[PDB]
Enzyme design. Structure first.
Site, PDB file in Angstrom:
ATOM      1  N   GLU A  51       0.837  -1.189   0.000  1.00  0.00           N
ATOM      2  CA  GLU A  51       0.000   0.000   0.000  1.00  0.00           C
ATOM      3  C   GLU A  51       0.867   1.232   0.000  1.00  0.00           C
ATOM      4  OE1 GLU A  51      -2.812  -0.059   3.115  1.00  0.00           O
ATOM      5  OE2 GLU A  51      -3.566  -2.045   2.563  1.00  0.00           O
ATOM      6  N   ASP A  88      -6.908   3.770   0.505  1.00  0.00           N
ATOM      7  CA  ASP A  88      -5.590   3.338   0.931  1.00  0.00           C
ATOM      8  C   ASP A  88      -4.582   4.492   0.899  1.00  0.00           C
ATOM      9  OD1 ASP A  88      -6.194   0.204  -0.740  1.00  0.00           O
ATOM     10  OD2 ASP A  88      -6.361   0.594   1.405  1.00  0.00           O
ATOM     11  N   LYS A 114     -12.364  -7.970  -7.943  1.00  0.00           N
ATOM     12  CA  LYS A 114     -11.891  -7.040  -6.935  1.00  0.00           C
ATOM     13  C   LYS A 114     -11.569  -5.682  -7.532  1.00  0.00           C
ATOM     14  CE  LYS A 114     -10.646  -5.610  -2.943  1.00  0.00           C
ATOM     15  NZ  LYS A 114     -11.701  -5.208  -1.962  1.00  0.00           N
TER      16      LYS A 114
END
Lengths: 169, 169
Positions: A51, A88, A114
């Site tokens: 991330e 994120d 996703k």
């Protein structure tokens, strides 16, 4: 006995930078002592690493626990209440807000699935933001593995491989 | 005989918006008369549609034939000569430049491969841009099919399915 655990803590201490964004979760991992526990923080970190990679690549602030509403209050943005999307990473350049979502998915299908779930979670905010004079640029970073710039890929694969060893049982 | 061709020209005329970004390639397709020819422009369009989709989603200008160097001259940006990357869309918000690349890949592998090739083609520009006070935000839009917002997915699949019928031989 079972020093996958210590090599793992050893790898972590070595390769995970002393960056602020990562200090938190790094001190988590290196504090753990139980096998199960260490393995959990391990997964949390692997994800955090990917991330924080994305954030850097896209020059975005990393987010760990803020909703977009909370974020915009930070940014001094006036806005009505939106859904509590938990992006994120994010960055506000003039009237442009970039929300960055990151995932790693290896099932070609569980992946693109996703992808959309994530693009959709974001775009749903688009129009309300626009009413408030904020252009939402959504960025989704689908990744098929956990590689990152600042860590050798051969090391990532060992790191994850390490966790599977630990999980058995 | 073989009116996959005309239904196809018929679908195109109907569903492809009268947008400027698309007028060019739409007039291409609808001008074609030969089977092989129409099929070629067809593929060029399918791709253009997905590119112009991305542009809209990310609020980027569409690019068809400009290098980044050419683009920045447009943008009145001073920069030394960079490599002649040919991005799919772009947008300059303050000191931030967004380059958008788009591809559709169905081979899970030929895909992620293509992802990196594209992220790499872009980031290589990062540091030279930064020296010139331009933050490069790179956006890659990997897609596993050709769907777009402004066209029903059931129609896209028919459209492409149509081309395969035409290709046989």
């Amino acid at each position: 006995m079972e020093e996958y655990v210590s090599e793992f803590k050893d790898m972590v201490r070595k390769w995970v930078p002393e960056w602020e964004e990562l200090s938190e979760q790094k001190n988590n991992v290196l504090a753990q002592v139980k096998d199960r526990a260490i393995t959990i923080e391990g997964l949390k970190l692997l994800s955090m690493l990917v991330e924080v990679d994305s954030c850097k690549k896209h020059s975005c602030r990393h987010n760990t626990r803020m909703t977009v509403n909370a974020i915009l209050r930070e940014l001094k943005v006036t806005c009505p209440t939106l859904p509590d999307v938990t992006p994120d990473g994010y960055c506000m350049v003039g009237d442009v807000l970039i929300l960055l979502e990151v995932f790693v998915r290896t099932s070609q299908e569980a992946f693109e699935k996703k992808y959309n779930q994530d693009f959709l979670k974001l775009m749903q905010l688009s129009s309300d933001l626009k009413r408030q004079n904020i252009t939402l640029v959504p960025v989704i970073d689908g990744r098929s593995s956990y590689y990152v710039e600042y860590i050798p890929d051969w090391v990532v694969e060992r790191l994850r491989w390490l966790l599977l060893k630990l999980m058995d049982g």
